[PDB]
Design a protein around this ligand. Structure first.
Ligand code: NA
Length: 410
């Protein structure tokens, strides 16, 4: 009983799709979701790097990460199999409903164990050894400690309908993967809160107000409303994926469209997920520095008590926009991996109630994701424009810092 086990990139995708689904169920927030995607990819990628002379190890490149154990030269191991095992095991550790990862895992294990028990056993064992190593490092990143950390008129207020307390005030205290510090990409400050009619703040408030009213005047056909809903990606609305998950989905689309092999797929997902996790830290750092009031609050208190945004306002401060920062970063990474002018059909939102939208490039998609927040009535211009810059600057740094691809024969 010694058939080969063919591991394909679609099995990695299976793990990431299941964790995605579980995240929705367990009600993970946008920044916490980015941490769930990153660590399991790093573990799998390290397995690949240790065994493929075209890819360099991230040990020594990511903060605190040391070399993984090498595989036993006396055993025949299928390294892709080990990489999938590592990915699933860490993914399971990072969500609450572990039984839902275990079901996916056990169903793969049963076929593998059935075809080649010895290869399966040796390969699983190595995958689990690596997951333990990577688990030790992930458990030193300050997430556990921040779980029980204690909790002008421009200050952010919780917003209706739910008036939830701000999400993840201390996300800036998580260990970044690549950044030298959480604040490395701190942006310029937002315009000073002001109700003076000639002020920069008031101009931007008036823009939010006016855009929403133009959308009203066009009616519910309007393309703006479709764009706002496509990118909304807010699990607190009173079944949706977060923005990091959506970009993980675009990374998958690109990898499948290019017929990228297991190693190239993992490379891409790892570079993207690491960048996004650092993008959330950078963006949340600024959110809780500037702690800026959301547009509906100022509009309903000072301008028009009947006005409502197209989208529900997320429960966290305004500046800079998460969508803008994370899309900026992700766009830069995918452009670097798969190229500019990469056209694609984005079907990531089809299982979540939406149609397909087509794009001519990752840059174009990011630009749409950023302006969707203006159509949505929940961000001012500065949070969007400055946020895209912040994410593109951060994603540039990540791509310039991480040396992963390194062809054996050049
Ligand atoms: Na290598």
């Amino acid at each position: 009983k010694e058939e080969p086990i063919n591991i394909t990139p679609e099995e990695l995708d299976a793990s990431i799709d299941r964790v995605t689904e579980i995240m929705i169920h367990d009600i993970f927030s946008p920044p916490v979701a980015s941490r769930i995607f990153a660590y399991p990819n790093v573990a799998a990628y390290e397995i690949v790097a240790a065994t493929n002379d075209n890819y360099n190890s991230l040990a020594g490149q990511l903060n605190g990460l040391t070399a993984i154990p090498e595989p036993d030269t006396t055993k025949t191991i299928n390294y892709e199999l080990a990489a999938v095992v590592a990915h699933m095991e860490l993914s399971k550790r990072l969500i609450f409903s572990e039984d839902r990862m275990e079901s996916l895992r056990d169903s793969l294990y049963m076929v593998w164990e059935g075809k080649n028990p010895v290869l399966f056993s040796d390969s699983k064992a190595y995958g689990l050894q690596v997951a333990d190593h990577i688990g030790e490092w992930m458990n030193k990143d300050n997430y556990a400690q921040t779980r029980t950390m204690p909790k002008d008129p421009g200050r952010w207020q919780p917003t209706p309908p739910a008036y939830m307390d701000g999400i993840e005030p201390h996300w800036n205290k998580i260990r970044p993967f690549v950044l030298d510090s959480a604040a490395q990409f701190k942006p310029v400050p937002p315009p000073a809160y002001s109700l003076e009619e000639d002020s920069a703040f008031y101009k931007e408030l008036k823009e939010v107000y006016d855009v929403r009213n133009k959308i009203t005047e066009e009616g519910d056909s309007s393309e703006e409303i479709q764009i706002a809903r496509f990118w909304d990606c807010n699990p607190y609305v009173s079944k949706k994926i977060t923005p990091g998950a959506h970009w993980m989905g675009i990374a998958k689309i690109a990898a499948r469209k290019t017929n990228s092999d297991f190693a190239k797929t993992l490379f891409a997902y790892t570079k993207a997920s690491v960048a996004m996790a650092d993008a959330f830290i950078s963006c949340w750092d600024e959110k809780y520095r500037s702690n800026l009031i959301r547009p509906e609050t100022v509009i309903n208190q000072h301008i028009d008590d009947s006005w409502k945004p197209v989208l529900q306002t997320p429960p966290f401060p305004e500046y800079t926009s998460g969508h803008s920062v994370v899309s900026g970063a992700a766009s830069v990474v995918l452009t670097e991996v798969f190229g500019d002018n990469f056209s694609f059909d984005d079907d990531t939102e089809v299982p979540y109630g939406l149609p397909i939208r087509s794009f001519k490039s990752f840059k174009q998609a990011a630009d749409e994701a950023a302006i969707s927040r203006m159509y949505g009535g929940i961000h001012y211009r500065a949070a969007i424009e400055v946020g895209v810059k912040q994410g593109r600057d951060l994603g540039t740094f990540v791509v310039n810092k991480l040396h992963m691809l390194s062809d054996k024969k050049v």
